[PDB]
Design a protein around this ligand. Structure first.
Ligand code: GDD
Ligand code: LDA
Ligand code: LDA
Ligand code: LDA
Ligand code: LDA
Ligand code: LDA
Ligand code: CL
Ligand code: MN
Length: 355
C-alpha cells in the first residue's frame, strides 16, 4: 500500500558515522517501499552535509544545509517544507531511535491515526541504561506539560523526537521555530483527531558527542508558557485570580457584617467563607470557564468545594513548612497563598470543569 510516499526527516549536527548504520537500518526496515530521507543540517563543522550526499548513490537521500539558520525544531520545520511525502517520519540520527519500529508507526498511520508517537512511557516502552532518578525527572518534566496543557493530558511522551504524521496535520499550520520540542508544538497547533502512542526502546547513542543535554529544560518551560498563552490557559488563570481576589473581599465583607449584626466572631467566620466560596464559583462558571461547563451545575459546585478546601490545606502546610525552614513569615504567607491559587486552578481546570 505504501506506494504513497514516506519522508523520513532527520535533523543533524555533527552526526557522522551514524549515517552509515542509520541509512542502512532505515533502508532495511522500509524495504521496497516508496520513501526518501531528508537530512537537514545546520552547516556542521564536522564533515557532513556532504557525507550524506555520497550515500545518495546508495540511498534515496535529499540533503539540506541551512547556514543562515540554526536550531532543532527549526530544522524539522524546514524538513516539513522540503519533504514531498504523504507521511512524515521524524527521528534522530544517533540510533537512539530504532529505524526498525518505523514500520509500526506508519502502520498506525495507515490504520487511521493522524499522528503516531514513538513513546518511551506507554506499556511496552523502554529506555535502556537509565537511572530511575533520571527517568522520573523525565516523567516529572513531562507531567508538568500534561497538567498545564489539558489537550495533551493523556499523552505519556509528548516530548519525544520520534513520531510520524500525515502531511495534512501540519499543512497550512504555523509552527513556532524556537526550541527543541516540535512534537509538543504539533500536538497543540496541528490538525488531527486521532493520536496513538507506539512503544519502542530508547537506545544508547552509539557514537558521537551529545548536543542537548542539558539545555532543554528552561526552553521547555518557556515553551509551555507560550503554548499556555496560545491555548487560552493563561487568560483563564488571570480571570481565576481576579475572581479569587473578589472572594477574599467578599469573605471579609460578610465577616465584618456578621459581628455588628450580633453574631459572635468565630461562629461568623464559617458563613462568611462559604459565601466567598459560592461567590467564587458563580463568577468562574459564567466567566472563567463559561465555555467548558458540563453536567449538572450542582456537581460542579461540589467539586469546586474540594478544590477550595485543597487550596486551604496546601496553604496551611506550605506555610508551616517554610516557617520551620526559617523563611520570614510574610514570604511564607505569600508563597502559601500563591501555591493555593495554583492548586485550586489545576483541580478546577482538570476536575470541576474538565475537558
Ligand atoms: N539541524 C540541527 N540538528 C540538530 C540540532 N541538535 C540536534 N540535532 C540533532 O537532533 C538529534 C538530538 O541530539 P541528541 O544529542 O541525540 O539529543 P538527545 O539528548 O538524545 O534527546 C532526544 O530525546 C529527547 C527526549 O528523550 C527529545 O526531546 C529530543 O528531541 C531528542 O529526541 C540529533 O540527531 C542531533 O544531530 C540542531 O541544533 N540543528
Ligand atoms: C484587580 C485588577 C484587575 C481588574 C479587572 C476587573 C475585571 C475586568 C473586567 C472583566 C469584565 C469585562 N467583560 C467584557 C467580561 O464584561
Ligand atoms: C459574561 C459575564 C461577564 C462577567 C464580568 C466579569 C466578572 C468579574 C466580577 C469579579 C470582579 C470583582 N472585583 C472585586 C475584582 O472587582
Ligand atoms: C469542614 C471545615 C472546613 C475548614 C476549612 C476552611 C475552608 C477555607 C476556605 C478558604 C476560602 C476563602 N476564600 C477567600 C479563598 O474564598
Ligand atoms: C458582602 C457584604 C458587604 C458588606 C459591606 C461591609 C462594609 C465594609 C466594612 C467597613 C470597614 C470597617 N473596617 C473595620 C474594615 O475598617
Ligand atoms: C506536614 C504538616 C505540617 C504541620 C505543621 C504543624 C504546625 C506546628 C505549629 C507550631 C506552633 C503553633 N502552635 C500554636 C500549635 O503552637
Ligand atoms: Cl477559588
Ligand atoms: Mn540522542
Amino acid at each position: 500500500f505504501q506506494s504513497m510516499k514516506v519522508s523520513v526527516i532527520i535533523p543533524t549536527y555533527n552526526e557522522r558515522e551514524n549515517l552509515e548504520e542509520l541509512f542502512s537500518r532505515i533502508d532495511n526496515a522500509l524495504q521496497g517501499l516508496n520513501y526518501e530521507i531528508v537530512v537537514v543540517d545546520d552547516d556542521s563543522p564536522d564533515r557532513t552535509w556532504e557525507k550524506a550526499q555520497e550515500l545518495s548513490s546508495k540511498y534515496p537521500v535529499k540533503v539540506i544545509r541551512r547556514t543562515k539558520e540554526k536550531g532543532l525544531s527549526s530544522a524539522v520545520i524546514r524538513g516539513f517544507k522540503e519533504a514531498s511525502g504523504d507521511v512524515f517520519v521524524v527521528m534522530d540520527a544517533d540510533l537512539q531511535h530504532p529505524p526498525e519500529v518505523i514500520p509500526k508507526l506508519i502502520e498506525a498511520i495507515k490504520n487511521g491515526s493522524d499522528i503516531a508517537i514513538g513513546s518511551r512511557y506507554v506499556k511496552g516502552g523502554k529506555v535502556e541504561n537509565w537511572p530511575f532518578y533520571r527517568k522520573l525527572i523525565s516523567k516529572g518534566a513531562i507531567m508538568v506539560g500534561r497538567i498545564a496543557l489539558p489537550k495533551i493530558r493523556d499523552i505519556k511522551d509528548p516530548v519525544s523526537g520520534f513520531f510520524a504524521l500525515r502531511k495534512e496535520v501540519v499543512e497550512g499550520v504555523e509552527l513556532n521555530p524556537i526550541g527543541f520540542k516540535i512534537l509538543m508544538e504539533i500536538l497543540i497547533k496541528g490538525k488531527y483527531s486521532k493520536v496513538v502512542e507506539v512503544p519502542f526502546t530508547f537506545g544508547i547513542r552509539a557514537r558521537g558527542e551529545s548536543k542537548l543535554k542539558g539545555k532543554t529544560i528552561f526552553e521547555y518551560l518557556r515553551h509551555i508558557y507560550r503554548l499556555m498563552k496560545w491555548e487560552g490557559e493563561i487568560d483563564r488563570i488571570v480571570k481565576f485570580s481576579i475572581v479569587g481576589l473578589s472572594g477574599i473581599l467578599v469573605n471579609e465583607g460578610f465577616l465584618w457584617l456578621f459581628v455588628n449584626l450580633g453574631i459572635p466572631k468565630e461562629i461568623a467566620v464559617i458563613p462568611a467563607v462559604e459565601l466567598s466560596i459560592l461567590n467564587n464559583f458563580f463568577w468562574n462558571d459564567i466567566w472563567t470557564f463559561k465555555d467548558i461547563r458540563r453536567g449538572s451545575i450542582f456537581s460542579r459546585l461540589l467539586k469546586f468545594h474540594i478544590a477550595a478546601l485543597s487550596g486551604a490545606v496546601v496553604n496551611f502546610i506550605v506555610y508551616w513548612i517554610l516557617l520551620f525552614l526559617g523563611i520570614h513569615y510574610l514570604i511564607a504567607n505569600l508563597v502559601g497563598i500563591v501555591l493555593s491559587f495554583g492548586v485550586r486552578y489545576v483541580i478546577n481546570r482538570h476536575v470541576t470543569w474538565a475537558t
